[PDB]
């Protein structure tokens, strides 16, 4: 089997992407944030504290003939940005782009943090990291991909995120029309539960390539590119007037600037992030100070190849017995 679904930016900055997901019988379609950095499929629901729901579409398990309470199971998650959610668990039928999993754990939120409430466009998350990170207790549950894997034509999914435009998540096949040149594959460590890999270096603009190992995670659920302070300083030093602002929470730059590109290495191959991808716009409405899309990972504890990086590539998440990651230009 295969599936193919379009993923759409939630706003003009590509702060996140939403993908429609069918849950239950009859189908209830919710727009979920596909997140290769976590492993829970959780939704706003009829159980979510009313004051914490503000415009989201909810899953109502009592209206699904295939929903079953997973008795005794609870979940609770906290994300790198400080947001969180928790609740109980149902199993139900879940379909993405024509690919159907029966008995998928659907984690129903009883509580969500303010960041989730305030984002009307995201109805929940669909985790695509390794199932070892799933938070359900006392019986850990599998991700949608892990459940689908054995049925797929090939045990893979791909992320093809757009810049200020829709893109695609495919399951079970590689669309050879969706990228240019060849796909370069690179080793993955699953030791921390992430799609963790080592980039071979970077360049800033038309500058020379610096060969250096950068361990990090491919994370569709993180907006920005978070790299070591040395790398980030080298990038922003090429932008007149750019500075790290403790008050704002990262590097800012004059909105009048033209940003250089940023290149990262995948083995001997190179992925080029155009400068415009690194512009996240005014820090506040009407400001001439703009927020940068490349930020320091210092104090995160891990480097994160988030959407800024991934949307410059066609990315293969290869879930074979020994997982790997593939990157192609597009």
Q: Given in angstroms, what resolution was this structure solved at?
A: 1.2
Task: Give ∠ CA 174-29-16 in degrees, rounded to 5.
Answer: 60
Close Cβ partners of 65 (under 8 Å, ≥ 6 residues apart):
24, 25
Residue at token pair 């993180």: 222
**Other Cβ atoms closer than 10 A to 7:** 23
Rounded distance between C-alpha atoms, residue 108 and residue 91, angstroms: 10
Question: For residue 32, what are the CA distances in angstroms to 46, 111, 129, 189, 221?
Answer: 16, 17, 15, 26, 11
* DSSP calls for 144-165: HHHHHGGGSSSSEEEEE--SSS
For residue 232, which phi and psi values (nearest 5 degrees)?
A: -65, -40
Which residues of the chain does CATH 2.40.70.10 include? 5-174, 175-330
What token pair was written down for 266?
Answer: 């995948």
For residue 277, which phi and psi values (nearest 5 degrees)?
A: -70, -15
What token pair was written down for 124?
Answer: 């929940």
Rounded distance between C-alpha atoms, residue 189 and residue 315, angstroms: 16
Tell which residue, 130, 295, 270, has the closest CA to residue 208. 270
In this structure, are residues 41 and 35 in contact, taking their beta carbons and an 8 Å threshold?
A: no
Rounded distance between C-alpha atoms, residue 5 and residue 17, angstroms: 12
What token pair was written down for 48?
Answer: 């979510």
DSSP 8-class letter at 278: G
In this structure, are residues 191 and 132 in contact, taking their beta carbons and an 8 Å threshold?
A: no
72 burial type by CB count under 10 A (0-12 exposed, 13-18 middle, 19+ buried) = exposed
* DSSP calls for 213-245: EEEEEE-TT--SEEE-HHHHHHHHTTSTT-EEE
Decide if 199 is catalytic: yes
Q: How many residues does the chain have?
A: 330
Q: Starting from the edge strand earliest in sequence, which strands make up the sheet with 279-282, in order?
A: 243-245, 250-254, 289-292, 279-282
Decide if 35 is catalytic: yes
SS3 for 269? strand
Outline where the chain has alpha helix (H): 114-118, 144-148, 229-236, 307-310
Name the experimental technique.
X-ray
Rounded distance between C-alpha atoms, residue 262 and residue 278, angstroms: 9
Rounded distance between C-alpha atoms, residue 114 and residue 80, angstroms: 15
In this structure, are residues 6 and 18 in contact, taking their beta carbons and an 8 Å threshold?
A: no
What token pair was written down for 59?
Answer: 């899953």
What token pair was written down for 129?
Answer: 């990291």
Q: 198 - beta bridge partners?
A: 215
Residue at token pair 């070892």: 132
Catalytic residue among 35, 119, 123, 160: 35
175-330: CATH topology: Cathepsin D, subunit A; domain 1 (2.40.70)
Rounded distance between C-alpha atoms, residue 25 and residue 61, angstroms: 9
5-174: CATH topology: Cathepsin D, subunit A; domain 1 (2.40.70)
Catalytic residue among 199, 261, 296, 297: 199
């Amino acid at each position: 089997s295969t599936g193919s679904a379009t993923t759409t930016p939630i706003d003009s900055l590509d702060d996140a992407y939403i993908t429609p997901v069918q849950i239950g019988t009859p189908a209830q379609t919710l727009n979920l944030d596909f997140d290769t950095g976590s492993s829970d499929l959780w939704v706003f629901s009829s159980e979510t504290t009313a004051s914490e729901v503000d415009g989201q579409t909810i899953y109502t398990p009592s209206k699904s003939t295939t929903a079953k309470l997973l008795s005794g199971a609870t979940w609770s998650i906290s994300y790198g940005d400080g947001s969180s959610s928790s609740g109980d668990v149902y199993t139900d039928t879940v379909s993405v782009g024509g690919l159907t999993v029966t008995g998928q754990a659907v984690e129903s939120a009883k509580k969500v943090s303010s960041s989730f409430t305030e984002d009307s466009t995201i109805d929940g998350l669909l985790g695509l990291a390794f199932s070892t990170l799933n938070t359900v207790s006392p019986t850990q549950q599998k991700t949608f991909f892990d459940n689908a894997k054995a049925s797929l034509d090939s045990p893979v999914f791909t992320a093809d995120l757009g810049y200020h435009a829709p893109g695609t998540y495919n399951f079970g096949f590689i669309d050879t029309t969706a990228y240019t040149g060849s796909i370069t594959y690179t080793a993955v460590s699953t030791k921390q539960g992430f799609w963790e890999w080592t980039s071979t270096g970077y360049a800033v603009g038309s500058g020379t390539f610096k060969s250096t190992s950068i361990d990090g995670i491919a994370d569709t659920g993180t907006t920005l590119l978070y790299l070591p302070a040395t790398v980030v300083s080298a990038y922003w030093a090429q932008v007149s007037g750019a500075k790290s602002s403790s008050s704002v929470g990262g590097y800012v730059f004059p909105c009048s600037a033209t940003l250089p590109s940023f290149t990262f290495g995948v083995g001997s191959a190179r992925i080029v992030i155009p400068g415009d991808y690194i512009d996240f716009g005014p820090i506040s409405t009407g400001s001439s100070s703009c927020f940068g899309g490349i930020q320091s990972s210092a104090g995160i504890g891990i480097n994160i190849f988030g959407d800024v990086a991934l949307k410059a590539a066609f990315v293969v998440f290869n879930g074979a017995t020994t997982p790997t990651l593939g990157f192609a230009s597009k």
